[PDB]
Amino acid sequence: GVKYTCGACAHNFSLNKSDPVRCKECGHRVIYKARTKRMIQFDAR
Amino acid sequence: MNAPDRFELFILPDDVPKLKITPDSRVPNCIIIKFEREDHTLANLLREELALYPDVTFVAYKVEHPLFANFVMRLQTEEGTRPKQALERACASIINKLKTLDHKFNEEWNIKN
């Protein structure tokens, strides 16, 4: 679905709204979403 | 959030003329010129060029507000001369002076090389 990342072991994964909020590799408590896929433009000013 | 665009200083819109001439009726044979999208760079050059002609009696310019990119210029001439004609004469004279300056700079730079 949507990509996440661990806060402790930097593991990338994806959860589907029914698992608890947790990391797979270590089991850490806080996770961060991944950067979007769209392309972002800046004015360089 | 209220900052205008930095290209409105120099890019002339299509509904805005570059130059607009109105006459000053108070004194004879005088005109008021508003230059849009210009600043002191052209104004001071033209003013000090026109100030050295014998037939130009009054010449001045001002930039009423620094946050708006225009200036207004008052130019008077003698009876026979028309201020417009003096303005083309001044423009042509400065063009010739800049061309001569460029030629001499290029020659000097080549010898210096």
Binding site: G7, V21, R29, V30, I31, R35 | -
Partner: protein, 137 residues
């Protein structure tokens, strides 16, 4: 009278330029046994009293992703509150502040002391000096 002229070119080259970070927080409450709020993108059919901002930026989890430009009044955390005894939900969405622009930086997601879902969304922006900013020696 304590005004001061500043070089526009120096501003353009980065003089007195600063980053700004604002973080919004939100969580799900428990009003009973199985009555709780949920982070989810709220569909119009099942929800009522929806905010006037746009919801088209939320992922399937009711959260926006880092890297997305956000304007004022835009929703950055979608949340629904169930209606006590379809169309059985009220919204508890968190909009962006009506004044601030910016770009989402770091959307954190964890659980609180009691195991309910917890979200922090940090926005980022850059403020360039202009007329009316205050400086001192």
């Amino acid at each position: 009278e304590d005004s001061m002229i500043m070089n526009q070119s120096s501003i353009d080259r980065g003089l007195f330029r600063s980053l700004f970070f604002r973080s919004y927080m939100d969580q799900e409450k428990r009003f009973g046994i199985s009555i709780v709020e949920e982070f989810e993108k709220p569909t119009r059919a099942t929800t009522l009293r929806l905010k006037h901002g746009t919801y088209e930026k939320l992922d399937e989890d009711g959260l926006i992703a880092p890297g997305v430009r956000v304007s004022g009044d835009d929703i950055i955390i979608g949340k629904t509150t169930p209606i006590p005894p379809y169309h059985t939900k009220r919204d508890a969405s968190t909009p962006l502040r009506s004044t601030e622009n910016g770009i989402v930086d770091q959307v954190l997601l964890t659980t609180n002391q009691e195991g309910l879902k917890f979200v922090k969304v940090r926005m980022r922006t850059t403020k360039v000096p202009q007329i009316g900013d205050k400086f001192a020696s």
